[PDB]
Design an enzyme around this catalytic site. Sequence first.
Site, PDB file in Angstrom:
ATOM      1  N   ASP A 180       0.890  -1.176  -0.034  1.00  0.00           N
ATOM      2  CA  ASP A 180      -0.108   0.057   0.140  1.00  0.00           C
ATOM      3  C   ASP A 180       0.901   1.393  -0.024  1.00  0.00           C
ATOM      4  O   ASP A 180       0.541   2.390  -0.816  1.00  0.00           O
ATOM      5  CB  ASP A 180      -0.875  -0.188   1.135  1.00  0.00           C
ATOM      6  CG  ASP A 180      -2.039  -1.096   1.134  1.00  0.00           C
ATOM      7  OD1 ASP A 180      -2.666  -1.360  -0.001  1.00  0.00           O
ATOM      8  OD2 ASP A 180      -2.416  -1.624   2.224  1.00  0.00           O
TER       9      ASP A 180
ATOM     10  N   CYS B 258      -2.196   2.701 -12.934  1.00  0.00           N
ATOM     11  CA  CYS B 258      -2.436   2.347 -11.256  1.00  0.00           C
ATOM     12  C   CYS B 258      -3.397   3.404 -10.882  1.00  0.00           C
ATOM     13  O   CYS B 258      -4.462   3.106 -11.269  1.00  0.00           O
ATOM     14  CB  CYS B 258      -1.008   2.694 -10.542  1.00  0.00           C
ATOM     15  SG  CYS B 258      -0.144   4.126 -11.132  1.00  0.00           S
ATOM     16  N   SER B 259      -3.407   4.105  -9.995  1.00  0.00           N
ATOM     17  CA  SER B 259      -4.515   4.988  -9.592  1.00  0.00           C
ATOM     18  C   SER B 259      -4.458   6.586 -10.591  1.00  0.00           C
ATOM     19  O   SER B 259      -5.337   6.597 -11.106  1.00  0.00           O
ATOM     20  CB  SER B 259      -4.221   5.332  -8.102  1.00  0.00           C
ATOM     21  OG  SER B 259      -3.133   5.802  -7.717  1.00  0.00           O
ATOM     22  N   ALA B 260      -3.383   7.363 -10.120  1.00  0.00           N
ATOM     23  CA  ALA B 260      -3.187   8.499 -11.000  1.00  0.00           C
ATOM     24  C   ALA B 260      -2.313   8.363 -12.142  1.00  0.00           C
ATOM     25  O   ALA B 260      -2.378   8.955 -13.123  1.00  0.00           O
ATOM     26  CB  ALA B 260      -2.509   9.360  -9.966  1.00  0.00           C
ATOM     27  N   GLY B 261      -1.905   7.103 -12.445  1.00  0.00           N
ATOM     28  CA  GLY B 261      -0.805   6.450 -13.600  1.00  0.00           C
ATOM     29  C   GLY B 261       0.285   7.370 -13.673  1.00  0.00           C
ATOM     30  O   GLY B 261       0.797   7.554 -14.839  1.00  0.00           O
ATOM     31  N   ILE B 262       0.922   7.669 -12.611  1.00  0.00           N
ATOM     32  CA  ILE B 262       2.370   8.448 -12.546  1.00  0.00           C
ATOM     33  C   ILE B 262       3.480   7.839 -11.788  1.00  0.00           C
ATOM     34  O   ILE B 262       4.534   7.733 -12.115  1.00  0.00           O
ATOM     35  CB  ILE B 262       2.186   9.850 -12.388  1.00  0.00           C
ATOM     36  CG1 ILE B 262       1.839  10.350 -11.007  1.00  0.00           C
ATOM     37  CG2 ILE B 262       1.216  10.356 -13.313  1.00  0.00           C
ATOM     38  CD1 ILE B 262       1.456  11.646 -10.261  1.00  0.00           C
TER      39      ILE B 262
ATOM     40  N   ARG C 132       3.552   4.262  -9.505  1.00  0.00           N
ATOM     41  CA  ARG C 132       3.838   2.640  -9.920  1.00  0.00           C
ATOM     42  C   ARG C 132       3.880   2.735 -11.306  1.00  0.00           C
ATOM     43  O   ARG C 132       4.641   1.856 -11.823  1.00  0.00           O
ATOM     44  CB  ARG C 132       2.714   1.871  -9.270  1.00  0.00           C
ATOM     45  CG  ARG C 132       2.657   1.721  -7.568  1.00  0.00           C
ATOM     46  CD  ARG C 132       1.317   1.070  -7.461  1.00  0.00           C
ATOM     47  NE  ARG C 132       0.971   1.160  -5.981  1.00  0.00           N
ATOM     48  CZ  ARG C 132       0.189   0.454  -5.284  1.00  0.00           C
ATOM     49  NH1 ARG C 132      -0.525  -0.492  -5.867  1.00  0.00           N
ATOM     50  NH2 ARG C 132       0.220   0.878  -3.938  1.00  0.00           N
TER      51      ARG C 132
END
Length: 483
Positions: free
Chosen positions: A383, A417-421, A423
């Site tokens: 996480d 991923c979430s924001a795509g920057i 991971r």
Amino acid sequence: RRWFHPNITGVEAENLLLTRGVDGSFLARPSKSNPGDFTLSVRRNGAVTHIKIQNTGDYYDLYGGEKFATLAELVQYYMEHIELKYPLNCADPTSERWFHGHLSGKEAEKLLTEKGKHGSFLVRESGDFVLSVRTGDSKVTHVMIRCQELKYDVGGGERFDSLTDLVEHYKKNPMVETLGTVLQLKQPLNTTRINAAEIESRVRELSKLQGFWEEFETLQQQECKLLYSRKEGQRQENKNKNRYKNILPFDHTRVVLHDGDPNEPVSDYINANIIMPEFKPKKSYIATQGCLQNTVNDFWRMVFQENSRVIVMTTKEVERGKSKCVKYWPDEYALKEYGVMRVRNVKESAAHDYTLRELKLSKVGQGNTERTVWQYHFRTWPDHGVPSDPGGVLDFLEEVHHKQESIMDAGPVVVHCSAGIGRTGTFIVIDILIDIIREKGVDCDIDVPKTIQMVRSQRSGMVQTEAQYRFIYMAVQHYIETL
Ligand SMILES: C[C@@H]1OCC2(CCN(c3nc4n[nH]c(-c5ccnc(NC6CC6)c5Cl)c4c(=O)n3C)CC2)[C@@H]1N
């Protein structure tokens, strides 16, 4: 980006803003109490306010503020929208590309001799300093930098407040030698490019008292050159298409959606960017945010139009009780229609670290448009932070690579991923680096911060933390060691 001081304490920051600042004066610094975090110190009504900025690897989260892709983007936002009026400038040269703290004269000359070219320069400590510049097709010239009463000079002319101010001046106004030699400061000495076989030695010197931090912070100082336009993501009609309001795609690399519903005024937008190594559709990537329930149809339109055959999901749908990405695929054996796109989930194959989903994508109405999309869903990423060992991620990237390579005329790999920057950026950089070693062999040249700077010019804040930066080195090392 001079408002960023890498080495000051909370107390030094306070005294700096109270003595040398005014109401509206501000600076940002790495946190001392919590390593890996940041503080924005602002002066308001004769007092100093300390605002926390947290980054676990997905974005910069300002307490009582918003979520941002970079610290420069965070500052630009509040300076164009507690008032941030006056940046309080840092004189410390530690994060400069050309500054090499305690480097000897003998070491500097061999560095310029073996790695330099015309215009290559560095600055080392002599409390005085030495500027060493290489000229030719060749020779190395040394310029002494005297520090007299907190000011710097080259033994004549102007006296500067910092080494940065002196270097900037002599870059615009090059020093001319008596017989006509122009001491052009064209580029800092490239000391980050290493031979792939010598990774273990570099990881060892970077791990000593650490060097990884100085290299990463020198990379961060350069992000202020990457404030490109993000206008399309700011359009009213595109605002609810973004997971985080301020984390927007650059207009010059954004995925433009064509053949959208003619009744929809704006059907061309997705929070996604094309990422090209050394900037072929095959060896390309699309870095994107996790789907919102209202962007699932846009996502499948993007996958279809780009001819993508492989999706890499690097997050769980839910992390720490919060939605990171909506389920954009059907249950195993189910068929769902997402607007004009049709998706069948054929099979789900579970591995230790990840899940593989065989999806059949097509456009509704046209039978012959059907193609298999392989979805690789990494499920074990912690996480917060990065995995303790890169083995799991490497085996995953090897599998994704072999799938992409087996598919004729496959479009870019979709990575999200979430924001795509964060991971996403970390997976893409590792994969670029490993592909260089695949194509050119262990006897090849790799430059980690150059690779990250290039990816970051195509999407804001690709690779978020020093922990990810360190993970990239550890992953490349492990790939080479098992070779
Ligand atoms: C105190 C420490 O002493 C040594 C010190 C300086 C030297 N060094 C270093 N670090 C980098 N981090 N990021 C970059 C960087 C940033 C932007 N663009 C690129 N490349 C693109 C092709 C243009 C790179 Cl390579 C770096 C870089 O160029 N150098 C040389 C290691 C750390 C620190 N001042």
